[PDB]
Amino acid sequence: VENLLTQLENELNEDNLPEDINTLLRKCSLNLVTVVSLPDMDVKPLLATIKRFLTSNVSYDSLNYDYLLDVVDKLVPMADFDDVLEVYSAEDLVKALRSEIDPLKVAACRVIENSQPKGLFATSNIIDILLDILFDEKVENDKLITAIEKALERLSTDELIRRRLFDNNLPYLVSVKGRMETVSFVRLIDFLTIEFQFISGPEFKDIIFCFTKEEILKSVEDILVFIELVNYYTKFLLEIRNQDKYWALRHVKKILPVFAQLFEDTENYPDVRAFSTNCLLQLFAEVSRIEEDEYSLFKTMDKDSLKIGSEAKLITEWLELINPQYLVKYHKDVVENYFHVSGYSIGMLRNLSADEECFNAIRNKFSAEIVLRLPYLEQMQVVETLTRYEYTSKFLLNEMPKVMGSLIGDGSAGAIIDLETVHYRNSALRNLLDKGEEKLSVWYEPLLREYSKAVNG
């Protein structure tokens, strides 16, 4: 099929355009995907033929260029790059990127994206030009912006590509960072987020990855930029925490209290609380979990600015988001009094129960009676949460056997069609079973039985 479709396509493209040309292109695309590997053919003529149409002095009304590019998009990664290179040389690509033809530029991006070796173009100005286009606010083609970003993420696993980006183009990158112009700025933030995944300690440059107190204060002038910056930093901390790049913390942590100061200062920066409250909350959640010594930094941001507990409307959010160890050590009074069990407080329960000391602060709010008054879906959400930890499991088993009996149920569980009820019940059962028969005493056999019924039907 494939060798055949592509052959037919190279033929058609080289007559005067047949009426089914776009139907053939669509079919080529679907087949290229489903099948994954190409046969033993020469893709050069077709690649060269398509290049002629893209670079062509002439535009064809009878041709769907989106469909044409999609064939290129699927076909290039499947071909041997040495063959693609023969049709699109480093020099052809430069020309294509400096052209006035967006579809041609997108094709060039696809080629560059699939470079082999990835460092192949690192010694030309191709990367420089891609950045020139990427941070041009006048460039409005969304397909091209995404094509560039896709090529850059693909190649940036390579160290030589990263050098070309952050060495050869550092001054330009810093100048883009300085404009804080909405369009180019969001692109720059997305670019940095992607690049930080690949950056090593020795490669890391503060001047481009980090913002000073002054830059942050300036970003508030336009709340969209500020919000983009908050989200940048939340993802930044998340990536650090996910990929264990703790070396990066010393570079970023010093400006974190500026976000908390802006959050507090409602009269001098009303836009911050009006439009940026939820993303700042997500940032502070990450800050409460950074690798630092005993909340040194976070405790001060809380004492000076966040003032967890002082604003009643935010208490549920704080107790849903902030490190529970921090919460019980500095706001035990709030934890002990604010929290009560209900469907509504499941978010808090999930967070507060993830530290043993913090869970002990809410434990007296639990009784079999309160839990058994919840509909079964919310019971299972509560029970599932309690099965996640040793200390909460032990509480469930020794103090709430009637809740355990509800988990085991009246024999109608197989009948349940509610997605989440089944998800949480099964997770609870499995979690408890993972503790092993000796910790489960008399619950072991019923749990094994209900689990088997659940998974085997």
From Swiss-Prot:
Name of the protein described by the UniProt record: DNA mismatch repair protein HSM3
Family, as annotated: Belongs to the proteasome subunit S5B/HSM3 family.
Miscellaneous field: Present with 468 molecules/cell in log phase SD medium.
Residues annotated as signal peptide: none
rRNA-binding listed as a keyword: no
Species of origin: Saccharomyces cerevisiae (strain ATCC 204508 / S288c) (Baker's yeast)
Pfam families the UniProt entry points to: HSM3_C (PF18794), HSM3_N (PF18795)
Function statement: Involved in DNA mismatch repair in slow-growing cells. Acts as a chaperone during the assembly of the 26S proteasome, specifically of the base subcomplex of the 19S regulatory complex (RC).
Compartments (UniProt record): Cytoplasm
InterPro entries: ARM-type_fold (IPR016024), HSM3_C (IPR040752), HSM3_N (IPR041335)
Main location (coarse class): cytoplasm
Single GO BP term: mismatch repair
Swiss-Prot/TrEMBL keywords: Chaperone, Cytoplasm, DNA damage, DNA repair
GO-annotated molecular function: protein folding chaperone
A GO CC term attached to the entry: nucleus
Taxonomic lineage of the native organism: Eukaryota, Fungi, Dikarya, Ascomycota, Saccharomycotina
Top-level taxon of the source organism: Eukaryota
UniProt keyword annotation of DNA repair present: yes
Subunit structure comment from the entry: Interacts with RPT1, RPT2, RPT3, RPT5, RPT6, RPN1 and RPN2. Part of transient complex (BP1) containing HSM3, RPT1, RPT2 and RPT5 formed during the assembly of the 26S proteasome.
